[PDB]
């Protein structure tokens, strides 16, 4: 009939993309994201300079962080950002690898569906090739020793991870501090690593060489009432929660002083309360007092004249870390502070950080301290932030290696070996589905191509030559000589990737590309 009928509210402005054009748009956005993430891959990659809406700038190479700050509007780009963030969450390394692999897989999928093949068939082929690749990756891996006695493989893995980041300026002490921190914090019996016990703290000034690992706790406070000594030797500490103030019940209360004698009694009660507080702090024998909630002038002076240094306003997590390091117990009231409830401190020192007024305390332990602290120093806020995120990457790699123990020899060797396995399997496969398998092989094999292109070498010829070397001599540890030291063999160059990291990369990218291929219709205002 002549009358045009309206079914959907506000349907004159809504937009709809349907059929193959929508899939083309999806693949195109994914290709754009992958091309953006391609340059900053591998040791020769270059950083990216992200500025937020507030105008503050950060220079970073972490793909998950770059995509998270990428203020993007396309839905496929949002899915790619979520992919990168999830890969960061589960593993902590290879955040750009998943994005590049997904982009390559979607590009090959576009090439395939140009030939009129169903997207679900492409997804099934991708899944089969991912299974083959994961099986080959588990077959190819070898194990390292996670022990303090021979820690060197841990340094090798952390040094390989710390490559392609600015902290490779040092590249040796960073791996050492990461390995030591994770080894100290880790609970080896449960094979669990807690990241709340590694208080990664940074401060500008100095050099990147000054970044150390305190086997104790650093806190951004100072000794109250500065007349007290700026450092104490091995001291007994009293971690405390209640403030050094006269008590008051939580329930609302009224204390009627009905006479002058009542007034004098209240005065005497307050004064003797302070005096008894200090006396029962001193009687335990502790040299250092630490309070979470701060206190007043009389407490300061009584603490000073009793030769008992103290600090205040220490935060909750900082209180917990201090008590774990010193071995003491957090007590919420003065009346239950016994000798057993003190902690031990190797030495408590105050540091001034040059000409600035800022001060900090360092607590060093002479005994076993389950907690540590990584202190970062540098010449820029951007350097500090990049350094701490790079060290977080290293810690994540070390804990992943604690919980899995198996490694593969990266640098492109793993991808090339998986590609050969996928292609060899796809040889003996019935047609109409081997196309997806070969597309998967090429898509995962683009990673050495991008690595070589970032390294400055010709990608295709070098990649073909190293693949021929891998297939001639059964040495699946031949990768792109990105650093230009010769020796295509990657055993000698000591490059280590974690098995779970690579297998998670492959599986997660395959699942994301399957979801992207599944989408058909888009309705958006």
């Amino acid at each position: 009939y002549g009358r045009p009928f309206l079914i959907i509210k506000d349907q004159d402005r809504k937009s709809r993309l349907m059929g193959l054009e929508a899939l083309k748009s999806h693949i195109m956005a994914a290709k754009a994201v992958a091309n953006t993430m391609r340059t900053s891959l591998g040791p020769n990659g270059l950083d990216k300079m992200m500025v937020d809406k507030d105008g503050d700038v950060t220079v970073t190479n972490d793909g998950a962080t770059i995509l998270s700050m990428m203020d993007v509007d396309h839905q496929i780009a949002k899915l790619m950002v979520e992919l990168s963030k999830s890969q960061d969450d589960e593993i902590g390394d290879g955040t750009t690898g998943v994005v590049v692999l997904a982009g390559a897989l979607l590009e090959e999928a576009e090439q395939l569906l140009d030939r009129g093949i169903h997207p679900i068939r492409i997804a099934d082929g991708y899944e089969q090739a991912a299974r083959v690749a994961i099986e080959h990756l588990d077959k190819i891996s070898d194990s390292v020793l996670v022990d303090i006695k021979d820690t060197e493989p841990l340094i090798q893995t952390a040094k390989t991870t710390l490559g392609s980041k600015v902290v490779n300026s040092c590249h040796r002490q960073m791996a050492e501090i990461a390995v030591n921190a994770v080894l100290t914090v880790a609970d080896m019996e449960r094979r669990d690593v807690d990241f709340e016990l590694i208080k990664v703290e940074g401060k500008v000034g100095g050099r990147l060489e000054d970044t150390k690992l305190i086997k104790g706790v650093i806190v951004d406070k100072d000794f109250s009432h500065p007349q007290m000594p700026k450092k104490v030797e091995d001291a007994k500490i009293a971690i405390l929660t209640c403030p050094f103030e006269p008590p008051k019940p939580k329930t609302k209360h009224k204390l009627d002083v009905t006479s002058v004698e009542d007034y004098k009694a209240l005065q005497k009660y307050e004064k003797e309360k302070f005096e008894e507080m200090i006396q029962q702090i001193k009687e335990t024998g502790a040299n250092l007092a630490i309070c979470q909630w701060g206190f007043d002038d009389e407490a300061n002076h009584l603490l000073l004249q009793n030769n008992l240094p103290a600090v205040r306003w220490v935060g909750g997590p900082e209180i917990e870390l201090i008590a774990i390091a010193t071995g003491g117990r957090i007590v919420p009231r003065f009346s239950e502070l016994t000798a057993e409830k003190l902690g031990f401190a190797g030495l408590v020192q105050e540091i001034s950080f040059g000409t600035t007024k800022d001060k900090m305390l360092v607590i060093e332990q002479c005994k076993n301290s389950r907690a540590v602290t990584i202190f970062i120093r540098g010449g820029n806020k951007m350097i500090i932030e990049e350094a701490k995120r790079s060290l977080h990457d290293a810690l994540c790699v070390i804990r992943n290696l604690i919980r899995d123990n198996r490694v593969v020899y990266g640098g492109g060797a793993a991808e090339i070996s998986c590609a050969l396995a996928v292609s060899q399997e796809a040889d003996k496969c019935p047609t109409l589905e081997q196309y997806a398998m070969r597309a998967f092989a090429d898509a995962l094999e683009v990673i050495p191509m991008a690595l070589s292109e970032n390294s400055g070498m010709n990608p295709i010829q070098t990649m073909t030559e190293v693949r021929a070397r891998q297939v001639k001599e059964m040495n699946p540890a031949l990768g792109i000589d990105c650093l230009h030291k010769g020796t295509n063999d990657m055993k000698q160059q000591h490059v280590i990737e974690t098995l779970i990291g690579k297998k998670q990369q492959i599986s997660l990218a395959t699942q994301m590309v399957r979801m992207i291929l599944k989408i058909d219709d888009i309705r958006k205002p």
Binding site: S25, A32, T39, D71, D73
Partner: protein, 73 residues
């Protein structure tokens, strides 16, 4: 990224080529040229004049406060 699809937002942009390093280099060289005329015992100091509240005016030679007060983009 110059592709015929735009994905960032109404206001977000990307420079992924020699344009980015061009902008960074010209900005850094502009800052350096701003500081350059205040070196040595024969250097001459500069005037920092506000464009707003209370119109703060300060005469200074060291580059720390010169770079802190001005608003770089």
């Amino acid at each position: 990224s110059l592709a015929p699809v735009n994905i960032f937002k109404a206001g977000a942009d990307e420079e992924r080529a020699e344009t980015a390093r061009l902008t960074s280099f010209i900005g850094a060289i502009a800052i350096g040229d701003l500081v350059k005329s205040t070196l040595g015992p024969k250097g001459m100091d500069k005037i920092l004049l506000s464009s707003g509240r209370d119109a703060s005016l300060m005469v200074t030679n060291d580059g720390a406060t010169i770079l802190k007060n001005i608003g770089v983009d």
